[PDB]
């Protein structure tokens, strides 16, 4: 039972599945069908998101952690 | 809580000195009346009066 | 206890300390005081130095309070002040031009005019003479009159009511009735004045 796991390991994690479905839905939205989740992992955005969820789930929630989270998701979602 | 916890508690029961299979609190009454003394034998009860 | 002799009363007026250099009697008084600069009483937790505060509202607060819920008395006083302010402004929205210019929107001076309406002026005392108790008219001191008016508003808000209507709307409607010379506390004041008129030949029984 993963309740006894202490750290947020990105392996088969749920927000990983959310941003992964996000990469599939976004690459369908752009109609550019390069669908390789292992290539989609190679972007700076999803790994800044990964470091932000790891830092946010282990280190308890501060303002600057949400600044880093906002910066990652803001350059991620093609929002200005 | 699941059997990960049940097995950790069972092995710490075999380790630290508690009973490994689960039981009732009514049956833990016998282990708390056995982990101490009866009332009559204390040096300040039967030797209340010298 | 646990205060002592010579301990002085609180001071709140900041501008009094700003410019006291104009007189000579109180000038020599605060020369005599600061020359001593005695052990004063500490400032209580109910009063402040602010300009947004009022003594009569804090007294009607404390005379409204049951026991140790200063928070609930604070909620009731805040709710009734805002509710009566918005009733006067909702009457402002249904006003004409001169009705705009004659309806007052400050709840504070309306409340103090309401208390001056609420104020009894001639009082009672039970005096025994010839074996009977006789109700004599006596003129009252000022703090007695104002205390009576405030507790009158409090108790006729409290118990002479229906169990339906909630208290800040209740006290707002009470202040509204007391503001226009037609509330029931005025009718009780008129009965008190009427019976002090009725026992007018007893006014020689007072020895003071």
């Amino acid at each position: 039972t993963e309740a006894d796991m202490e750290e947020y390991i990105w392996e088969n994690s749920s927000s990983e599945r959310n941003i992964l479905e996000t990469l599939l839905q976004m690459k369908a939205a752009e109609k550019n069908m390069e669908i390789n989740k292992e290539e989609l992992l190679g972007t700076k955005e999803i790994e800044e998101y990964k470091k932000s969820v790891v830092s946010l789930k282990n280190e308890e929630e501060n303002e600057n952690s949400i600044s880093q989270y906002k910066e990652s998701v803001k350059r991620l979602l093609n929002v200005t | 809580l699941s059997e990960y916890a049940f097995r950790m508690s069972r092995l710490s029961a075999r380790l630290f000195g508690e009973v490994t299979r689960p039981t009732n609190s009514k049956s833990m009454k016998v282990v708390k009346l056995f982990s101490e003394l009866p009332l009559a034998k204390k040096k300040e009860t039967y030797d209340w009066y010298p | 206890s646990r205060y002592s002799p010579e301990f002085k009363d609180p001071l709140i007026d900041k501008e009094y300390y700003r410019k006291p250099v104009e007189e000579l009697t109180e000038e020599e008084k605060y020369v005599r005081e600061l020359k001593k600069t005695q052990l004063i009483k500490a400032a209580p937790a109910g009063k402040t130095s602010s300009v947004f505060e009022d003594p009569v509202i804090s007294k009607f607060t404390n005379m409204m309070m049951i026991g140790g819920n200063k928070v609930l008395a604070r909620s009731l006083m805040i709710q009734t002040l805002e509710a009566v302010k918005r009733k006067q402004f909702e009457k402002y929205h249904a006003a004409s031009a001169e009705e705009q210019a004659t309806i007052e929107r400050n709840p504070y001076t309306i409340f103090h005019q309401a208390l001056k309406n609420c104020e009894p002026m001639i009082g009672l005392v039970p005096i025994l003479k010839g074996g009977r108790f006789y109700q004599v008219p006596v003129p009252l001191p000022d703090r007695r009159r104002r205390f009576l008016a405030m507790k009158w508003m409090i108790t006729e808000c409290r118990d002479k009511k229906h169990q339906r209507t909630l208290m800040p709307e209740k006290l707002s409607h009470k202040l509204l009735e007391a503001f226009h010379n037609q509330g029931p506390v005025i009718k009780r004041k008129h009965d008190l004045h009427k019976m002090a008129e009725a026992n007018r030949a007893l006014a020689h029984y007072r020895w003071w």
Binding site: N18, I19, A29, K31, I66, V73 | - | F52, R86
Partner: protein, 353 residues
């Protein structure tokens, strides 16, 4: 002297030059775009002034710069406007909904998610929405006000799936959804069947360019927070046991395109939450952290003096601060002291003073 009310009702015309502006909204417009959900202590302000005058809060405008250029190719995109309690978290969602009806989007307005959780007394089960308990009364609250949010685009929907209504009735094909939402509002036994079938039908037609769907749900901490409503043998349930809200949780999973969903975390009835928790992960919980569908957290801040000076100077033309010495400069600095430039604690003083 603060620049307040020359800027008219135009959420499509808010610049950064337009700062601190009490923009007046016509009251008929609030009959169209906000009868569904609003904070309860805000209704005192409007019916006393007849001025729905929202000052320019800089994060309240800043989300609109993410709604001009959010493309309709991209899916359902979450947005949260969180912060300290009383900074107008529930009022900063009010700034964006008036834009989307001005840009003719599809307003899936939800008033308050806390009332979906707490304080509903009469309880039914379900058979058509897969055997879970559900509230027909809370469905009855929602189904009436939703139509008058947007009435132009609800009847243009064609329901392209034959749904079964009863053992006496069904649903007719290609009908306007203005029928289908309100066809069984009379037969309240399965008016909780009128939500999960219907909102998942608005998922399909959102993908095309005729409809722009956006979830507008207030206080999402209750959607993944464990509820207080109990069963018959004194057993509490999950928030995943309510078939009224179980299909509602299907929507914030980016499964449709064409619109940009907005949500506002609130602190009125945050059950099993301390009062000093005000952040998203601190309120939504663990179930509100995994199923985040990556959201953009908007930290609603406190006032600057530019929002502070706009406030009381607005109240001076309205002759609202009735006290004698209150417009003195130091009498501003005590309201600046006691209310700490927070909007909701200033209105409490400007309620009675």
């Amino acid at each position: 002297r603060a620049i307040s009310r020359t800027n008219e009702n135009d959420p499509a015309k808010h610049g950064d030059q337009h700062e601190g502006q009490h923009y007046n909204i016509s009251p008929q417009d609030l009959e169209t775009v906000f009868p569904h959900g609003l904070p309860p202590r805000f209704v005192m302000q409007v019916k006393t002034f007849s001025e729905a005058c929202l000052m320019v809060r800089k994060p309240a405008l800043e989300l609109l710069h993410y709604l001009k250029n959010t493309s309709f190719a991209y899916p359902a995109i979450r947005y949260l406007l969180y912060g300290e309690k009383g900074t107008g978290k529930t009022l900063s969602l009010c700034h964006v909904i008036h834009f989307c009806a001005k840009q003719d989007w599809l307003i899936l307005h939800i008033p308050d998610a806390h009332l979906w959780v707490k304080n509903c007394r009469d309880l039914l089960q379900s058979s058509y929405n897969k055997q879970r308990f559900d509230q027909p009364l809370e469905a009855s609250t929602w189904l009436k006000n939703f139509k008058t949010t947007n009435e132009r685009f609800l009847n243009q929907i064609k329901v392209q799936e034959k749904y079964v209504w009863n053992k006496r009735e069904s649903t007719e094909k290609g009908s306007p959804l203005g029928e289908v939402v309100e066809q069984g509002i009379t037969r309240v036994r399965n008016a909780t069947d009128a939500v999960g079938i219907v909102l998942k039908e608005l998922k399909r037609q959102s993908s095309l360019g005729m409809f722009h769907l956006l979830v507008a749900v207030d206080g999402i901490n209750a959607l993944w927070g464990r509820t207080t409503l109990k069963r018959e043998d004194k057993s509490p349930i999950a928030p995943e046991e309510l078939a009224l809200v179980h299909n509602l949780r299907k929507m914030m999973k980016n499964d449709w395109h064409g619109g940009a969903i907005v949500s506002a975390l609130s602190q009125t009835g945050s059950l099993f939450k301390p009062r000093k928790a005000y952040l998203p992960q601190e309120l939504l919980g663990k179930e509100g952290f995994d199923a985040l569908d990556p959201f953009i957290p908007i930290l609603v801040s406190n006032y600057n003096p530019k929002e502070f000076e706009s406030c009381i100077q607005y109240y001076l033309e309205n002759n609202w601060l009735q006290h004698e010495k209150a417009p003195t400069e130091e009498g501003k600095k005590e309201l600046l002291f006691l209310s700490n430039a927070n909007p909701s604690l200033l209105e409490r003083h400007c309620a009675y003073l």
